[PDB]
Amino acid sequence: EEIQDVSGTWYLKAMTVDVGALRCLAGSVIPTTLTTLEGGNLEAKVTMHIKGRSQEVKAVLSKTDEPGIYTAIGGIHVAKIGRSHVKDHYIFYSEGCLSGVPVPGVWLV
Amino acid sequence: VSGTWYLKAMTVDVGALRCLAGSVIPTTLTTNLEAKVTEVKAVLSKTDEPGIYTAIGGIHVAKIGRSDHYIFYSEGCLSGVPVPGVWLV
Amino acid sequence: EVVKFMDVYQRSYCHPIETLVDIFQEYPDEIEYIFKPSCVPLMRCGGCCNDEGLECVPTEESNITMQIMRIKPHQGQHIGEMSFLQHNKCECRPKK
Amino acid sequence: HEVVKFMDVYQRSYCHPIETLVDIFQEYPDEIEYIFKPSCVPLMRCGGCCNDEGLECVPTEESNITMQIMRIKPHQGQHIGEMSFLQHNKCECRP
Numbered sequence: 001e002e003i004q005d006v007s008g009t010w011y012l013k014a015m016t017v018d019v020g021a022l023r024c025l026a027g028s029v030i031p032t033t034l035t036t037l038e039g040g041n042l043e044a045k046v047t048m049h050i051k052g053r054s055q056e057v058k059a060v061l062s063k064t065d066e067p068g069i070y071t072a073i074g075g076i077h078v079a080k081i082g083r084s085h086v087k088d089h090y091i092f093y094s095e096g097c098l099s100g101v102p103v104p105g106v107w108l109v
Numbered sequence: 110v111s112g113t114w115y116l117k118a119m120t121v122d123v124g125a126l127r128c129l130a131g132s133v134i135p136t137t138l139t140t141n142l143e144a145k146v147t148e149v150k151a152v153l154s155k156t157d158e159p160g161i162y163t164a165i166g167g168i169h170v171a172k173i174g175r176s177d178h179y180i181f182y183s184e185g186c187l188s189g190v191p192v193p194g195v196w197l198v
Numbered sequence: 199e200v201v202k203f204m205d206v207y208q209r210s211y212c213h214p215i216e217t218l219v220d221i222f223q224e225y226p227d228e229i230e231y232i233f234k235p236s237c238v239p240l241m242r243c244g245g246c247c248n249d250e251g252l253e254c255v256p257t258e259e260s261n262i263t264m265q266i267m268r269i270k271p272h273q274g275q276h277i278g279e280m281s282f283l284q285h286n287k288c289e290c291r292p293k294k
Numbered sequence: 295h296e297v298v299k300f301m302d303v304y305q306r307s308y309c310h311p312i313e314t315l316v317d318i319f320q321e322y323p324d325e326i327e328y329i330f331k332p333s334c335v336p337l338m339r340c341g342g343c344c345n346d347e348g349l350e351c352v353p354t355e356e357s358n359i360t361m362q363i364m365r366i367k368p369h370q371g372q373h374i375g376e377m378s379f380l381q382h383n384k385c386e387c388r389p
């Protein structure tokens with residue numbers, strides 16, 4: 001039993017790290033915590049490693065786009081890695097990654 | 110040409126042979142069925158020939174390759190121990 | 199037309215895939231026989247874990263039995279049933 | 295079934311294109327400073343056996359396929375870009 005319907009297209013509403021110049025946010029993660037918020041928004045905590053040692057980042061994602069501060073990043077496409085058996089291993093990437101040239105980004109491992 | 114065929118006649122010395130098999134591209138395949146493969150000729154039917162090829166058994170034929178290459182084996186190949194035979198390549 | 203990123207990633211990720219394996223690799227003490235066919239299709243762990251520190255390896259195996267023509271030096275030939283190992287499930291885990 | 299019968303084994307093993315998961319570095323060997331995700335791709339390639347040391351299984355029809363791959367230049371930038379790969383559509387056993 002786990003939170004269902006995480007696969008799909010989501011938009012960042014808030015994130016706890018500075019994504020400054022970033023346009024391409026992507027990765028392959030088992031979230032440290034995933035929470036359904038009152039209204040159907042999702043909050044993800046992922047425990048990563050910024051500019052050195054290891055930190056936990058929270059993001060709140062919504063099915064509705066807010067013309068806002070994350071526009072360069074674009075919609076976040078999320079899919080379960082179905083060949084990782086069952087459960088909670090996801091791949092994601094943002095729309096800003098679709099570019100003929102490299103753009104500033106992060107890959108979460 | 111796939112399916113079981115039983116041997117009616119062929120231009121080969123059966124000798125002690127019980128297991129006939131191989132992988133072939135026939136030169137010809139006319140009508141019964143004569144097959145010609147270099148040279149070896151053989152005739153075959155969906156029907157039996159009492160007491161003559163009986164140790165060799167029926168001949169199972171299937172087409173190989175993804176869209177005239179056949180492989181075949183005789184029923185006598187279906188033994189728990191090795192038996193006299195040949196592999197026609 | 200272009201294969202989209204998520205489709206490539208899902209298709210390539212570590213899992214069991216039909217792999218054509220030489221029977222002499224499975225039966226290396228039988229390299230004096232001739233086998234027909236000489237290779238067999240076996241489900242084996244394949245694909246990528248997308249991290250140079252991880253390797254794609256089996257977690258569950260099973261047996262499959264196949265009729266093979268076995269040509270024994272100087273003793274004739276027959277179809278014999280030969281058993282082979284298959285992978286049913288795979289994982290990505292550390293190399294070393 | 296209990297056993298895979300002989301003609302089925304032969305048909306399934308005989309020279310033909312088969313899905314193969316190929317490391318991207320094998321196809322782009324000088325791009326070893328990049329990290330790709332995924333790191334391998336599914337390509338149809340001639341495989342299986344010709345059962346006759348006189349013969350090798352080789353392509354007679356090939357096609358190119360384009361796939362979106364995440365290409366990472368570490369500490370520089372990343373993006374999904376299109377990469378071309380060669381596939382095989384038809385094979386044969388030749389001398």
Ligand SMILES: CCC/C=C/C[C@H]1C[C@H]1CCCCCCCCCC(=O)O
Binds near residue numbers: 006018025051058106
């Ligand atoms: C279940 C969905 C898995 C997660 C999807 C997206 C959630 C992870 C949030 C989106 C991006 C993750 C935050 C990116 C970290 C940026 C790091 C930049 C920096 O510190 O320099």
Ligand SMILES: CCC/C=C/C[C@H]1C[C@H]1CCCCCCCCCC(=O)O
Binds near residue numbers: 149170179194195
């Ligand atoms: C559509 C293909 C059907 C093919 C049928 C060919 C089968 C009739 C068998 C052909 C016989 C050839 C046998 C070779 C002679 C055996 C002697 C060899 C030896 O041991 O010295």
